[PDB]
Amino acid sequence: LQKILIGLILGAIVGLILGHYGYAHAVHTYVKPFGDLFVRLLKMLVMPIVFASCVVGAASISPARLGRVGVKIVVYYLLTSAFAVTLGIIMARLFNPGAGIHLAVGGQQFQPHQAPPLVHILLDIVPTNPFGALANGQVLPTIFFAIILGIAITYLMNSENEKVRKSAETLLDAINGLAEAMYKIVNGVMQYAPIGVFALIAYVMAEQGVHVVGELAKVTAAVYVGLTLQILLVYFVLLKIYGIDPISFIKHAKDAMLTAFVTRSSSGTLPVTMRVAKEMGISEGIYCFTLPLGATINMDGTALYQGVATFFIANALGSHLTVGQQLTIVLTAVLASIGTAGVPGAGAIMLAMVLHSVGLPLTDPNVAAAYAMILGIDAILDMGRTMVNVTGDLTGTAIVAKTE
Template identity: 55%
Template sequence: MGDQQKAPVKKGILGWYFNFNLLYRILIGLVLGALLGIIFGQKILWVAPFGALFVRLLKMIMMPIILSTLVVGASSISPATLGKVGIRVILFYLLTSAFAVFVGLMMGTIFQPSAEMATLASEAAGKAAADIPLSQTLINIVPTSVAQAVVNETVLQVIFFAIIFGIGVSYLRISKDDRLQKAGEAIYMVFDGTAEVMMRMVTAIMQYAPIGVLALVAEVFAKQGANVAGSLAIVTLACFSGYIIHIVLVYGGLLKLNKLSIRRFFKDAKDPFITAFVTRSSGGTLPVTIKASANLGIPKDISSFSLPLGATINMDGTAIYQGVCAIFISLTVTGHSFTLGQMGIIIVTATLASIGTAGVPGAGAIMLLMVLEAVGLPVEAGTAVAGAYAMILGIDAILDMGRTALNVTGDLTCTTVVAKGMGQLDKEQWA
């Protein structure tokens, strides 16, 4: 999910660049890159290092973001709070996110979006992952060495450790022993500070994204020609089809199962939905979502816990995006989709990674890096994977509008259903 924060007006020689909307800059970079690649062909390949730099910057921050945000997210939830409400809310969020990845994979399988690009090195990497059984992959989630997992960028192992470590920190923070409580707070503040620094680094790196996208896409079109352009429209169609199906089947189904009026729900849910779609920020939409929850008769003690938590760990729209884009990149690079084992890996990775997905521009794209790493398709400069990834990043802002709106709607749906299940929903508001 993205977060289109309003940046302060900047002055100076490059003020015009930084004050121009990042969404439009990235889209312009995508179009210019395609045009330059088509017009100049191999002569434009001198821009390739600028694209390689962007890829390296993204990969540089991937592991620190996973560690810091997941530890902070897990340690922010007090074990004492994880009672009936907490467990129900978290289960709903994780289950709907896992199903969303499945929807995304199905949309990718149905629409089969791909571009005619291939490299033998990337193809070998993709096929190597298929040889690992799903059972072994699940066992491998538990690292034997955390340091080695970080150095080798073994994403699932790092995610597993960060969550367990964060839960341990949460226990220290509520300890009655003053020494342990202070230690827990100190550890939390270190990771919280690190997470804040990483968020600012993401924001800074995304300012370079238009240039990086231009260079990467120019390289792709210079080498591959214009035969990749139509695939982006198919990716967009596949994602938005998944968003609509998820709202109708999952959210509509949950409301129906709990005998709640879908029309009544969307009467108030439409406000946060539209706000999230326009702003691309679930955090910025949170006040609107909380107001809608009050109108729906949800008690404050439930909404104040569930909705902010959902903004952190409930990423259904982002999960659908991961499934579609992963299949697009796999078909583009290897010529074939994923095996059932690899799809299982994607579901596990995307669901767990969603717990720590940051609410900043480009967060969904960084999460996609993690998913690709997990299935043996690392984004390396100069490869077809990097080229396909660059094309996805070029339309990421468009996809982000839909997935953020879906994320916010999911937060409100799950919170409503939990309140109904706990018998705390004000029925008068639904009369």
């Protein structure tokens, strides 16, 4: 723990004062592979640790639960993200980012995006080669197969024969072995988190960061201080009502938060998030369902970033942002949040479609050269949103746990 915190501070404040000194492209040839090494070795775990812990997590009460508890949190995930965009727009009207007239014109970003198929992405939730999907990544058709297997072995320990139930105990206990084998490594990769972390911010400061000034200084304030409010106004209040101690939650989830802010992957944070929930006394049927579906649908941090930026660009050109009917951001930023992907960046590239709905496309060359000011400093605002993106799952995971 302490080596991570001592590594994180002196890391950024080593890499910050090399950025003002023109060593951006030397902190690349030195510091930014060790941060990948930390990344790779978290990504290596993700596939077995989700599959084993989810064939085991269908051994507990099979109907309801994985469909009554699963619907509990479905109500939670939409309301949390729904409120997060209300917070971030009110923060962009308590602040005012965009008083300087958008400087450069030219160099337009993309334009002919196509999406969604919509129907043939809901059907792509159900796999065909259970072995293929499981071999690509695919952290959501892999879940669906695991639960439908785990139920099938529950009913198989009920049949009259012994050699029926005597091969099913073999199977399921063997798969349980890997489950234990995969939490077992996940702290032996934690291991090297101090030096991993020291690297990761040492870079993301020299290349972008020694950069923040002006109205980009005003907007970074409205991102972080808007994000602060989500932690202590929505979580420390909903944990406080639902029995659980506020501080005992954050004393335990500290090791998953740090590997979310520093890493910016929600997806490659997930084995260490899965362990932290076993550390605080959660039964498998809940957490190894609500965390993998959670790190792809509950995007609380992204909803505030997507709300506050679809307002910085309205101010930067001078659009009146609809006096009353700006709630058409409130529907779109939720529908973008659930859309938004795991790996870093993709929170902003889906910010494209929430600008599109209220009425400013990136075809217009002076809208999307002023989008180039924000996309210049994206990774900085990604560290922040990713922390809330991943803590918002864990908050609901234990608040649905102590209900059913």
